[PDB]
């Protein structure tokens, strides 16, 4: 069979059904946020029922909106076309009528910037709230009455099939030649990123220290946020006039990262744990990652590789 979400209003006078909480972007398109609402004609003297989709943002504080969309009980006289396969089965199962929202391409994804412990308000980020309501006037000051708020997510995960290798070259001045590369285009949360490091130091001075980091890039446009999610400060030295090779390994995980106020996480529904933000393949938050190889000489040198931190396309179900 299957399972769905069925939040209803505080006074029994309205109910929202959703098939799921997450919607996915195949890059050039976006899934429709599609559901049905049960309506009560016997309460509904106001004579109109409407549903809202809102791509909000939260950041004293600012609450913005990046996208707002609305849809028509009594049934629309002509807009019967976009009824989705999911909705028709609730229609069969139940006085309930569709609501649907095709978020346009080139809009941000479900990103929860951290709820830093020092703050207690609603979490920052691009939260998708679907808000079904009954009203007499679409301009009325919406009270806590028969409306039902429900947060959703719109997300992106692993780009299937093989892709280009994050090979890189950088040299400084004889040459201090630095090369690094990974083994895959895409990589996954919490797994080891295989960091290769070739160095040829024709200078007199020693490479004092080597840092590998994996760094989180999240562009905020309501600016961009930069923070290292992982780091390996190996002691290996490229001795003067030598050829060097080493393979490093790092794993980025949230566990240590919780204290770094302002990181970005995959969209929280309520307060449940999620992975660090899957990369975005535009307003809002656009998030991507790189593996960084740095050499410290007794005076730094570095190379920085395009790293796609993501999650496999989950075939079984969404997170939770």
């Amino acid at each position, epitope marked *: 069979g299957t399972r769905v979400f069925k939040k209803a209003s505080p006074n029994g006078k309205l109910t929202v059904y959703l098939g799921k909480r997450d919607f996915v972007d195949h890059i050039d398109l976006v899934e429709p946020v599609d559901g049905v609402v049960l309506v009560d004609p016997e309460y509904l003297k106001e004579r109109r029922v409407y549903v809202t989709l809102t791509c909000a943002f939260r950041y004293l504080t600012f609450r913005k909106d990046l996208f707002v969309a609305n849809v028509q009980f009594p049934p629309a006289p002509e807009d019967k076309k976009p009824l989705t396969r999911l909705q028709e089965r609730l229609i069969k199962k139940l006085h309930a009528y569709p609501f649907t929202f095709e978020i346009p391409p080139n809009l941000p994804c479900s990103v929860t910037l951290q709820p830093g412990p020092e703050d207690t308000g609603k979490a920052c980020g691009v939260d998708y709230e679907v808000k079904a309501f009954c009203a007499e006037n679409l301009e009325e000051k919406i009270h806590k009455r028969n409306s039902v708020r429900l947060v959703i997510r719109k997300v992106q995960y692993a780009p299937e099939r093989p892709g280009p290798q994050p090979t890189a070259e950088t040299t400084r001045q004889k040459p201090l030649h630095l090369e690094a590369s990974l083994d895959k285009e895409i990589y996954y*949360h*919490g*797994e080891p990123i295989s960091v290769n490091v070739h160095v040829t130091n024709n200078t007199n001075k020693t490479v004092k220290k080597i840092k590998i980091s994996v760094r989180q890039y999240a562009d905020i446009c309501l600016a961009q946020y930069k923070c290292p999610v992982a780091m390996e400060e190996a002691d290996d030295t490229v001795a003067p006039s030598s050829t060097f090779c080493k393979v490093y390994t790092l*794993t980025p*995980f949230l566990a240590n990262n919780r204290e770094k106020r302002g990181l970005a996480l995959d969209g929280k529904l309520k307060h449940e*744990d999620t992975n660090l933000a899957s990369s975005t393949l535009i307003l809002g938050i656009i998030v991507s990652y790189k593996v960084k190889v740095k050499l410290v000489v007794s005076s730094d040198v570095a190379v920085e590789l395009p790293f796609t931190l993501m999650h496999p396309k989950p075939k*079984e*179900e969404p*997170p939770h």
Partner: antibody, heavy 116, light 106 residues
Framework: VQLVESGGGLVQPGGSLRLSCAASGFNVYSSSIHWVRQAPGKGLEWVASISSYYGTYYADSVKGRFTISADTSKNTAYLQMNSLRAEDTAVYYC?????????????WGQGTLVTV | DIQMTQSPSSLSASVGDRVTITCRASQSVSSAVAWYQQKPGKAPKLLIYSASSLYSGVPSRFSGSRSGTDFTLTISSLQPEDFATYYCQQYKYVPVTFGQGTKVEI
């Protein structure tokens, strides 16, 4: 891909143990490691779980006595034991599960016998 | 402590039998249920997850099911290699109580 644990043996009650669980083919931070015991002729009892990605859970029937940890650089867990008792006598296992997302315990080690 | 009430404690299931396990929790755990198979003395092994999905490495004869907060692992047809002790397991709440186990013998 494998799990193998060691450290089972005889101890009189009041003793301690340090079971270990090496594995290959997967890494701890992508996975959650567990211990479970099948006491003589009886069924499985959850004892402890470590969710590597997030920073540890272990049951009331073991609480304050059994403790789970892992050493990451060598892809291994532990199950430190204090104030063991007679009922603790069980053959102990180690287990791994997909952390993202927790989909039940996928692989188990061959089993090690502990008697108190 | 969700009393993850699994039964029967043992079952004779001749080859070809429709082995079926009921399993009632004392509390709602949504769909977060796994199942495992233990061959005498060694590693248990997961058969079903998300209370429905079959794990990679598991013969398709194993099947997850659900109705309310009853969970039920099922084998379409029990082969000679199946016999072991199987365990329901809910994994929404801590403790993650396994069922006391249904042992199967010829």
């Amino acid at each position: 891909v494998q799990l193998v644990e060691s450290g089972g043996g005889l101890v009189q009650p009041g003793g301690s143990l340090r079971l270990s669980c090496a594995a290959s083919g997967f890494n701890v931070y992508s996975s959650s490691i567990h211990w479970v015991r099948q006491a003589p002729g009886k069924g499985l009892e959850w004892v402890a779980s470590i969710s590597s990605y997030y920073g540890t859970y272990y049951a009331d029937s073991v609480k304050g006595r059994f403790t789970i940890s892992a050493d990451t650089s060598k892809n291994t867990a532990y199950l430190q034991m204090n104030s063991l008792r007679a009922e603790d006598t069980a053959v102990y296992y180690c287990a791994r599960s997909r952390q993202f997302w927790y989909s039940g315990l996928d692989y188990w080690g061959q089993g090690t016998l502990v008697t108190v | 402590d969700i009393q993850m009430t699994q039964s029967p404690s043992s079952l004779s299931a001749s080859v070809g039998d429709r082995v079926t396990i009921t399993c009632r929790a004392s509390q709602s755990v949504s769909s977060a249920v796994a199942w495992y198979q233990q061959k005498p003395g060694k590693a248990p092994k997961l058969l079903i997850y998300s209370a429905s999905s079959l794990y990679s490495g598991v013969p398709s004869r194993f099947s997850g099911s659900r109705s309310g907060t009853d969970f039920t692992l099922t084998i379409s047809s029990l082969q000679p290699e199946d016999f072991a002790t199987y365990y329901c397991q809910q994994y929404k709440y801590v403790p993650v109580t396994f069922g006391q186990g249904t042992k199967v013998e010829i």
